[PDB]
Design a protein around this ligand. Sequence first.
Ligand code: ANP
Length: 327
Amino acid sequence: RSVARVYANVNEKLGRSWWDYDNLVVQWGVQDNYEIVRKVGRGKYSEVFESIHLPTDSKCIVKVLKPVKKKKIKREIKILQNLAGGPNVVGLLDVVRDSQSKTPSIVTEYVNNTEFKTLYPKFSDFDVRYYIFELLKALDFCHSKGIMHRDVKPHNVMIDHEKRTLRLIDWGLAEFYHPGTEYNVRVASRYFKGPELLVDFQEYDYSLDMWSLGCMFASMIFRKEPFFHGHDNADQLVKIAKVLGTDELYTYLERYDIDLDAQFDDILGRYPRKPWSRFVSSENQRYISSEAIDFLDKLLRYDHQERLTAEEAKEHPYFEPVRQAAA
Ligand SMILES: Nc1ncnc2c1ncn2[C@@H]1O[C@H](COP(=O)(O)OP(=O)(O)NP(=O)(O)O)[C@@H](O)[C@H]1O
């Protein structure tokens, strides 16, 4: 009941060799070439440690996957393998596992990150333009290769501000895009979930990541994290409606023939479109420009087919200072 505007054809054109991650044979590395040092992060499905690849004595990242459906492990590995050498995608170094328990780990390149709540407010307007544009290179790449990231949130973007370098990480929710496939809507982080997830519209595509990038981008330029701050997946849709308005929400549901949950209507009610200008203040004015708002406004749409493609987004006037500086 939806197909993507772009890249709908990719997985058909690349082999079954490219998306059939169920039939992947995993060449496990050697567990004991890696020694864990320092625990640096935590997810619901993973341990992340700073570690050493002992033979090279190299700092790397080991991510210990909570034993979970083997199918899912097979998917993340094949995706990482596929995307290899792509711009600003985290480098996959190894896959290992325990001899006895068979608990797998992914070994990835280390990135000297700064936590975003500290790093983002140190940003200039050029900085935001530059790093979003480098994030747009990763989304455009992986989308061009039939893959939706599906967890694009600042926690999964690692920025080394001294090297001026960027990596997208946590491809644990990523999928291959197949035209017409119904996908699980329980993806993303509540704050970065697109409306299509919140109304249980299952036939979504790469445009999910663009909404997500929009929320992240609104955090940065408006200095509100999160920009939409829902207490649960129901309230999340309400916080979105208080900004984009409900008039546009009902034309969107009507256009895609979504019927809402019955008790959604005790809580939603009627909201006029709050304009983007009403979010400007003295403390966030540094990031604000007529180009930024226009760009943000073409990511944050109810209808996933009115959103920019990562490629169209790269052409936007907002990124002209970074394109120019490139040369
Ligand atoms: N390559 C890396 N370099 C540095 N830190 C990293 C790297 N990969 C992951 N981390 C840290 O580990 C945290 C969790 O890693 P992540 O890959 O997001 O695992 P997860 O279990 O999928 N968690 P979640 O994002 O909630 O789904 C990240 O937020 C980073 O702070």
